[PDB]
Design a protein around this ligand. Sequence first.
Ligand SMILES: CC(C)CCC[C@@H](C)[C@H]1CC[C@H]2[C@@H]3CC=C4C[C@@H](O)CC[C@]4(C)[C@H]3CC[C@]12C
Lengths: 340, 128, 268, 240, 58
Amino acid sequence: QSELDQLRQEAEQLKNQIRDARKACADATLSQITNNIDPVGRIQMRTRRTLRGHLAKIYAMHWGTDSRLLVSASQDGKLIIWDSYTTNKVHAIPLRSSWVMTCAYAPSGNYVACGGLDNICSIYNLKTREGNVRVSRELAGHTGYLSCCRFLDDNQIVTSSGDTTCALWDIETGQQTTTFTGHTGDVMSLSLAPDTRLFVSGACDASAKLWDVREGMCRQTFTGHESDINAICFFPNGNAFATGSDDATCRLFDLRADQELMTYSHDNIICGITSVSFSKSGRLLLAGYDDFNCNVWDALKADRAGVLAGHDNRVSCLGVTDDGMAVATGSWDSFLKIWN
Amino acid sequence: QVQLQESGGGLVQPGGSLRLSCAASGFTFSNYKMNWVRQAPGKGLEWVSDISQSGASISYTGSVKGRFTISRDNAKNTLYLQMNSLKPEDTAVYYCARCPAPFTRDCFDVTSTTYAYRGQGTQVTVSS
Amino acid sequence: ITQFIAIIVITIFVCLGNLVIVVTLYKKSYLLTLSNKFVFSLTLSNFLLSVLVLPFVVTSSIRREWIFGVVWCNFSALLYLLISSASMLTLGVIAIDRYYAVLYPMVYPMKITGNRAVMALVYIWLHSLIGCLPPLFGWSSVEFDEFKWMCVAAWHREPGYTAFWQIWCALFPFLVMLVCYGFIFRVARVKARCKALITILVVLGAFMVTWGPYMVVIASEALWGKSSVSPSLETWATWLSFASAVCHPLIYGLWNKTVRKELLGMCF
Amino acid sequence: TEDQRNEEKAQREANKKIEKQLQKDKQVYRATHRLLLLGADNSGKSTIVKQMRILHSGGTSGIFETKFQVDKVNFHMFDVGGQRDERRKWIQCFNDVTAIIFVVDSSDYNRLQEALNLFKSIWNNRWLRTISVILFLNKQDLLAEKVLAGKSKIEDYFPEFARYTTPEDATPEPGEDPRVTRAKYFIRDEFLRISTASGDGRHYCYPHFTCAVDTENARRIFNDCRDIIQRMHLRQYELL
Amino acid sequence: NTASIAQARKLVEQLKMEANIDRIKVSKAAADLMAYCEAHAKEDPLLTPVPASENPFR
Ligand SMILES: CC(C)CCC[C@@H](C)[C@H]1CC[C@H]2[C@@H]3CC=C4C[C@@H](O)CC[C@]4(C)[C@H]3CC[C@]12C
């Protein structure tokens, strides 16, 4: 026990040293130097599409790089690919397991990924010579439910799971290439950088970590929130990111300052966050809530600029097009809507 | 940085008295519910007691009814456990835990292994 | 003149209430479940009745005579009888559907299907047409009745048809509704441990309060001749029948939670 | 003109053919009932599902599945055994099930409080409201001999047992001992007390006594699903 | 015993690597964020709405 106590003392000393190092750099606060800029409080928008046809509640959706086609997942056991402009259905894939909770769309548009409560990630080929969508690969090795996945290219993909780990895969061989093993609680969100050199994740231990894809190691950790984290997103320029939690607050972190520098909250909000996203320029921050309403935040002044209403059950997913022309949201009422 | 630090304990004779203290920081203490949990030698974690946000609706396990008492102090962010007429089988390590959400009645995973929002623990021994 | 305003009020209500429901059902097409098609037909038929018949009643009530031709005298009466019988039968069909839904919940999704619903919809209108065949041919006479202020079958001079139609188009669905809701009531009462009683009484009274006086007036005229009833009672009994089409849209529309929500989403 | 042709191909071929299959699948989805099975490791829930499968899919990866049919109605039952210790996140995937099956070892006095706490937590969760529960007390045969042996007492775990008295609604079996009935109904009342306290009119619980060698368990679930679906149908027509 | 010890090691040699990273003042970070956000203001249809003739949706 003496050695364990000694190691605990060393950990405490290093924690104190890091906290002291952080405080030295806090010369100014963002709210005190962005005080003189203009507000953007005129934001108001209306829904003008409604995609209908899912039988059960929706968990995940993702935009294509052309910003016209998108995919969605529902726990009735279907993946539907939609055409946003005409609202026509172009594909419908029945899944082996009904308890899906994530999906992704390849940047090249040739493949889609899927997975969930069966601890497996499945890859589907959308352009085979026969003209029929068919399963092409299954990835196994996680010991917990799959929670998120994002393509790097046609041949490799990154994933996070409830077993407290993340992995990098080679689709051709089907083998894990790297494993990330720092978090203490369940991991259920990840975000790729614009250059795909590094990525960030958040877990149930109320902390986030920065990972190096090639070196396979962590070099930063953030501890602002005070409860479970379930959403995360990068800033457009890649120097910051935003986080959402069930303590009913959002926070912004800076990679280079290594510190928290903004919080978004209001007294009359008690529900938790479920989604986060940024507009094309980064001035606006959009987030979904368990009150099935969505608030638009002035990310640079910290005020609310608007609200999106029209769903009648928990808002589950949220996404912005690659060119910033529209925003799509899903909900547990089994409908999906496009705004502005 | 959420952290909980227990205090008190030590060795006591059978039939003796003792009380524990728990200090909390890094979150709004007045919003959450609090719990006491212990692990005896060669056994898993076990339920003891809890107390709500305002200090009403207290509950106990049948093994300690009439002997143990729980209380809060919201103005100081501390939690107490008063123990009287201790018995030999009370020898265990006692932890300070809080339920995961700020306004709910759910306390699913407080007794789970590797739970996040729990302290390090203190040793209590009863012997002749 | 106190009478004359009543037709305008009734006509505006009968038109607008049914128009709102049919528009809401048509635009929001996904709401057309198996049971809502009966409501769709009930509202559309009454909307069509509101314009093809009622204005002529107004003109006859003012001019106190049938200014139009003999050709339209027959068509108006035939449409009136047909739509009235269809509306009466649709309620019994709805009652049967609710009875099967409540008493056999686990087997309901397979016992009743879309094809059988279409068969029932066809059967309703065939039953109505068989109920109006004899006036269509020369077997029964149709003429303008003074204090009714419309063209209708001559009840007082044809005691056979006035009993055949009355028994076959009105009493049968009423008995069906009575037995079905009686069976539902005791299950609701047992598992309540008085909203069920209030709902059943409202549904059952909206039918008889409106179609009751007309039936007894017809019976009295057929049994003891035209002079056995006062003209004012005749007019009011005839005019309460048109008020039946006011209760149908409200009760089988707005009282439904989903359709009410969808309508409020469009009207605010 | 090629734009018109592409629009025609899309709207005609893809959308309508997809919608036809979706309409076909909707009926099959609506005609089936899906259930969640919960319990501790010492309970015999696996024995229950195997026994009622013998009365009449396979494999397991993250989840285990079971099929059974009674009166031509299909039931699907799921057992989430591939996950680790914490439940609070994957539990809310089942907000849409018709009912939850809860199994408890009645003969184990030591572990009864843990099951009681789990039941309370499940009952009071935000996303698990409005869902009824079927409760099975599983090991009456062991409880009978444990009580009649007298070596281990109940009041050392539940001191309120000393003041308990059997209710008038008790229906003992013909050969049962009165004190076995007393302990058995006390254990049942412990769960019913939590159930009836915060339970609103939208939420009900159905207890049962069962044993390892038992064959009526399949029909009981059918009879309880009957009741809850009947209440739902009564509710939609403003009769409740 | 040994497992907790090893976890404590991994923790402390994680803190070694985390404590050595370079840092900058918050002023530079906030100024960079504001400058980037202001530079791309004209290229955001949601921040500044778009005429109906160019919107793909209605
Ligand atoms: C015997 C007959 C004449 C009685 C008829 C009573 C009618 C007028 C009553 C009984 C139930 C009533 C409905 C009860 C509930 C609502 C919901 C409310 O949000 C809008 C009005 C609405 C839709 C009411 C409209 C009027 C209504 C349909």
